[PDB]
Amino acid sequence: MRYVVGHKNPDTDSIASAIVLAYFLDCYPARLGDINPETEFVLRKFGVMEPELIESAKGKEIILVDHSEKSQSFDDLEEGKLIAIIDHHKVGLTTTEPILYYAKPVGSTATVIAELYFKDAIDLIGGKKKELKPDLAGLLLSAIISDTVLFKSPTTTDLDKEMAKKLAEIAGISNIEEFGMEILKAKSVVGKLKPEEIINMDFKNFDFNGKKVGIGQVEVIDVSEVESKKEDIYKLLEEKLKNEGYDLIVFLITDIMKEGSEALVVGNKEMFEKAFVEGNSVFLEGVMSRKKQVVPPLERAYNG
Amino acid sequence: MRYVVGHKNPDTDSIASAIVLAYFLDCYPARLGDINPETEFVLRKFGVMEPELIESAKGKEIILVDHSEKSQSFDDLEEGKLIAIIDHHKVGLTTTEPILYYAKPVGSTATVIAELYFKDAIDLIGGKKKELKPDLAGLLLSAIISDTVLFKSPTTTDLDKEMAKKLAEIAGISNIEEFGMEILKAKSVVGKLKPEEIINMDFKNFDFNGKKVGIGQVEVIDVSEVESKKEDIYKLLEEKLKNEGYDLIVFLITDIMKEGSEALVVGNKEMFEKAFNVKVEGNSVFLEGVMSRKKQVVPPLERAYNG
Ligand SMILES: [Mn+2]
Ligand SMILES: [Mn+2]
Numbered sequence A: 001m002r003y004v005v006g007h008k009n010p011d012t013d014s015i016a017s018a019i020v021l022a023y024f025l026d027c028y029p030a031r032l033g034d035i036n037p038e039t040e041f042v043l044r045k046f047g048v049m050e051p052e053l054i055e056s057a058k059g060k061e062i063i064l065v066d067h068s069e070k071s072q073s074f075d076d077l078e079e080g081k082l083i084a085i086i087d088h089h090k091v092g093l094t095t096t097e098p099i100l101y102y103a104k105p106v107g108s109t110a111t112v113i114a115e116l117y118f119k120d121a122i123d124l125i126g127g128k129k130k131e132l133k134p135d136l137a138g139l140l141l142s143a144i145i146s147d148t149v150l151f152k153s154p155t156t157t158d159l160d161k162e163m164a165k166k167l168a169e170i171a172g173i174s175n176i177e178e179f180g181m182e183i184l185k186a187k188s189v190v191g192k193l194k195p196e197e198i199i200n201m202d203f204k205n206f207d208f209n210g211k212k213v214g215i216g217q218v219e220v221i222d223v224s225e226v227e228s229k230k231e232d233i234y235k236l237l238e239e240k241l242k243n244e245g246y247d248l249i250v251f252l253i254t255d256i257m258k259e260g261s262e263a264l265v266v267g268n269k270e271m272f273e274k275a276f277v278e279g280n281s282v283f284l285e286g287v288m289s290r291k292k293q294v295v296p297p298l299e300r301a302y303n304g
Numbered sequence B: 001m002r003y004v005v006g007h008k009n010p011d012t013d014s015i016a017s018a019i020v021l022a023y024f025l026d027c028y029p030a031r032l033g034d035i036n037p038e039t040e041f042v043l044r045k046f047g048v049m050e051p052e053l054i055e056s057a058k059g060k061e062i063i064l065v066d067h068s069e070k071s072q073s074f075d076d077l078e079e080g081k082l083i084a085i086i087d088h089h090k091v092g093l094t095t096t097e098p099i100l101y102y103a104k105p106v107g108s109t110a111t112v113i114a115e116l117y118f119k120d121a122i123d124l125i126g127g128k129k130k131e132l133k134p135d136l137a138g139l140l141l142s143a144i145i146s147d148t149v150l151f152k153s154p155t156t157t158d159l160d161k162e163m164a165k166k167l168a169e170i171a172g173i174s175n176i177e178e179f180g181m182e183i184l185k186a187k188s189v190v191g192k193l194k195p196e197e198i199i200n201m202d203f204k205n206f207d208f209n210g211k212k213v214g215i216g217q218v219e220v221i222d223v224s225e226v227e228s229k230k231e232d233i234y235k236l237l238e239e240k241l242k243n244e245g246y247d248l249i250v251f252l253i254t255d256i257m258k259e260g261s262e263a264l265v266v267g268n269k270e271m272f273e274k275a276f277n278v279k280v281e282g283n284s285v286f287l288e289g290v291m292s293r294k295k296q297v298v299p300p301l302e303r304a305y306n307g
């Protein structure tokens, strides 16, 4: 009756935070979509099973992790009962009743959970005060690394590193740098998938001043792979744009090594141009984080 | 600079939480409105000075306590630098960037702060591990009692009681029940005030799916005097409705002993009747067991509006 769920097109933070929190809250973990390769890698590595799929909150109690935007959560959230939101994004969700809300401007939701655990404050968000086994500690570690892109992303903070170090200990990972590289590789395999799989792997929806806007992403070590599919990708996006009523779609081809992204712009390029473009896209040096470096200047332009 | 501020038409929770958190965060305490009789009583009691009054957030770093609603905060909140929100109400504010946000559905903001304090985790929200002196412990205590209406309100949780007992110990308050009776008599004096004062003393404004709704409230031990002003109060609420463009206004005459509220309904009566599965006879209705605005009135009403 009570579930912990991350956002649609869940990433590692959403799956790991849901699983670990469900453990401390003594309820059910779940996912609002399929898990990507990087997550499949981690769950398999630490021996944790994939959470059950959930698509409707109707008649259920829900704890949301890693997001606060209706567009990224249940469509029928109102028909269920929101219990809590543990996140690290800007406040985007409004509620009708008091809920347990805990957000911090850090690198991942796992970082937030972990800090509460080591600080002996898990009970502050309903946690039962149980031990954090190495398998779960491995999930949280992977979430931090996944979310911060091995501490290279500008959303990375001191708390993120400090927590990674501690979790790495309980998890038994001696070389975070190397384990992290393994994670960055699993993240990269997305490039070998079909264009449709690539776009729907990590796409997020936003509502900037009434205009539906989507921002997808791909994070690879070597962009060569995705670039050969770029044309087909950009094509499927133009279709998605018109067929699903988007006013704009930004697709980030993030090069992990150059720490910058090629931003494919679909739809209202004017707004994009006003927010930050020769033809297909443009490269944005140093841009890696959607939430930190792309959503803000974009929302600022739609309601300004 | 950095300020910790409560909401417009401040109650004791808003004042105490602003002062105490400011003390822990080492910044300036402040208020968005005038202090009510109950708070004046509580402040004088623990020898604590009244927080400075401010009105504009422009150029200020803000930390909001006890509220998450634009229409209850600075008119220019946006022009300020929102640092954090420590509350116990529903989420009503969206932010432009990640922020420290900590809200628990307990009886008061004071409860949240105290729980962080005793767990030695005040640093989780920026605290500086300072010691809670008896005077400030007394304010938190007063805030809890005030917000829960002496643990009578359904927002009251075990945490609220647990925290109250520990705070009473520090503040040197041997009998919480007796002190609470005083606080309850303090809320009641509002009933003695003129209609206009009773209306503005604890009026909250909201945005429900684009609609401007107002929910005021008065809590008394003997409602008879407020009832003798009910008529005049209603007229004023009718004027407030059309002049300030409210889609709906509800004023709760809360009977502390019967633990219920007589709701005065102005404007969109239909939406109200829908919200509470009850048709209104006249311009008001008594809601049995209803004492909490945030837990019993806002939820069904905002759900009706956007639903
Ligand atoms: Mn995520
Ligand atoms: Mn995350």
Ligand SMILES: [Mn+2]
Binding pocket: B007, B011, B013, B014, B066
């Ligand atoms: Mn208040």
Ligand SMILES: [Mn+2]
Binding pocket: B013, B014, B066, B088, B107, B108, B109, B147
């Ligand atoms: Mn309060």
